[PDB]
Amino acid sequence: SQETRKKCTEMKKKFKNCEVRCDESNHCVEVRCSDTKYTLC
């Protein structure tokens, strides 16, 4: 529980230039830099 919101904060630390968006419905954090877009579930 809330491992996704933790992971979103962590991905924002690493990828603050990229669009790191938090979730809870899918428990998957999508990150969207420009050409590179990846989702850590």
Short mmCIF file of N, CA and C in Angstrom, two decimals:
data_model
loop_
_atom_site.label_atom_id
_atom_site.label_comp_id
_atom_site.label_asym_id
_atom_site.label_seq_id
_atom_site.Cartn_x
_atom_site.Cartn_y
_atom_site.Cartn_z
N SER A 1 0.85 -1.21 0.00
CA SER A 1 0.00 0.00 0.00
C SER A 1 0.88 1.26 0.00
N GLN A 2 0.59 2.19 -0.94
CA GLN A 2 1.25 3.52 -1.06
C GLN A 2 2.75 3.39 -1.48
N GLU A 3 3.14 2.15 -1.86
CA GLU A 3 4.46 1.82 -2.43
C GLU A 3 4.64 2.54 -3.77
N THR A 4 3.50 2.74 -4.48
CA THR A 4 3.44 3.47 -5.75
C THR A 4 3.72 4.98 -5.55
N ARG A 5 3.14 5.59 -4.50
CA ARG A 5 3.33 7.03 -4.22
C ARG A 5 4.77 7.29 -3.72
N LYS A 6 5.29 6.33 -2.93
CA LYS A 6 6.71 6.29 -2.50
C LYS A 6 7.62 6.24 -3.73
N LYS A 7 7.26 5.34 -4.67
CA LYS A 7 8.04 5.09 -5.90
C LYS A 7 7.99 6.31 -6.82
N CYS A 8 6.86 7.06 -6.77
CA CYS A 8 6.69 8.29 -7.55
C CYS A 8 7.64 9.37 -7.04
N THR A 9 7.71 9.51 -5.70
CA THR A 9 8.61 10.46 -5.02
C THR A 9 10.09 10.13 -5.35
N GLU A 10 10.40 8.82 -5.34
CA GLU A 10 11.75 8.28 -5.64
C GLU A 10 12.15 8.57 -7.10
N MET A 11 11.18 8.36 -8.01
CA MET A 11 11.39 8.60 -9.45
C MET A 11 11.50 10.11 -9.73
N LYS A 12 10.86 10.95 -8.89
CA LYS A 12 10.98 12.43 -9.00
C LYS A 12 12.37 12.90 -8.56
N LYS A 13 12.97 12.19 -7.58
CA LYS A 13 14.34 12.46 -7.10
C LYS A 13 15.36 12.19 -8.22
N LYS A 14 15.17 11.06 -8.89
CA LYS A 14 16.06 10.58 -9.95
C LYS A 14 15.79 11.29 -11.29
N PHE A 15 14.51 11.62 -11.56
CA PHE A 15 14.05 12.06 -12.90
C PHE A 15 13.22 13.36 -12.75
N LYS A 16 13.82 14.38 -12.11
CA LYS A 16 13.15 15.68 -11.86
C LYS A 16 12.98 16.51 -13.16
N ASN A 17 13.79 16.20 -14.19
CA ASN A 17 13.63 16.81 -15.54
C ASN A 17 12.45 16.16 -16.29
N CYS A 18 12.16 14.89 -15.96
CA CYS A 18 11.10 14.09 -16.59
C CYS A 18 9.75 14.28 -15.88
N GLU A 19 8.65 14.03 -16.61
CA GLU A 19 7.28 14.11 -16.08
C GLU A 19 6.94 12.81 -15.31
N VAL A 20 7.35 12.74 -14.05
CA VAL A 20 7.04 11.61 -13.16
C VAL A 20 5.64 11.83 -12.54
N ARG A 21 4.65 11.02 -12.93
CA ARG A 21 3.26 11.15 -12.48
C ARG A 21 2.89 9.98 -11.54
N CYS A 22 2.37 10.33 -10.35
CA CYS A 22 1.97 9.36 -9.32
C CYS A 22 0.59 8.78 -9.65
N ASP A 23 0.36 7.53 -9.23
CA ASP A 23 -0.93 6.83 -9.39
C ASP A 23 -1.29 6.07 -8.10
N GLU A 24 -2.45 5.40 -8.13
CA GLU A 24 -2.93 4.53 -7.03
C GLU A 24 -3.90 3.46 -7.58
N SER A 25 -4.61 3.80 -8.68
CA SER A 25 -5.59 2.90 -9.31
C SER A 25 -4.90 1.65 -9.92
N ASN A 26 -3.78 1.88 -10.62
CA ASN A 26 -2.99 0.82 -11.28
C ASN A 26 -1.76 0.43 -10.43
N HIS A 27 -1.37 1.31 -9.47
CA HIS A 27 -0.15 1.15 -8.62
C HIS A 27 1.13 1.17 -9.49
N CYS A 28 1.09 1.97 -10.55
CA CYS A 28 2.16 2.08 -11.55
C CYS A 28 2.51 3.56 -11.75
N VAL A 29 3.79 3.90 -11.55
CA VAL A 29 4.30 5.26 -11.75
C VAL A 29 4.85 5.39 -13.17
N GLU A 30 4.20 6.22 -13.99
CA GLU A 30 4.69 6.56 -15.32
C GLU A 30 5.62 7.77 -15.21
N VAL A 31 6.69 7.74 -16.00
CA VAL A 31 7.67 8.80 -16.12
C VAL A 31 7.76 9.15 -17.61
N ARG A 32 7.74 10.44 -17.95
CA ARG A 32 7.63 10.88 -19.35
C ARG A 32 8.61 12.05 -19.62
N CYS A 33 9.84 11.71 -20.01
CA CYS A 33 10.91 12.70 -20.23
C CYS A 33 10.64 13.56 -21.48
N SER A 34 10.78 12.96 -22.68
CA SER A 34 10.45 13.62 -23.97
C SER A 34 10.16 12.53 -25.02
N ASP A 35 11.20 11.74 -25.35
CA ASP A 35 11.08 10.58 -26.26
C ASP A 35 10.98 9.29 -25.43
N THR A 36 11.62 9.29 -24.25
CA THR A 36 11.65 8.15 -23.34
C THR A 36 10.49 8.26 -22.32
N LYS A 37 9.60 7.27 -22.34
CA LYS A 37 8.44 7.17 -21.43
C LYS A 37 8.37 5.72 -20.94
N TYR A 38 8.48 5.54 -19.61
CA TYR A 38 8.51 4.21 -18.95
C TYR A 38 7.65 4.23 -17.68
N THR A 39 7.13 3.06 -17.28
CA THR A 39 6.20 2.94 -16.15
C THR A 39 6.64 1.81 -15.18
N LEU A 40 7.10 2.21 -13.97
CA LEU A 40 7.56 1.29 -12.91
C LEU A 40 6.36 0.89 -12.04
N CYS A 41 5.93 -0.37 -12.18
CA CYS A 41 4.83 -0.95 -11.41
C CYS A 41 5.40 -1.68 -10.16
#
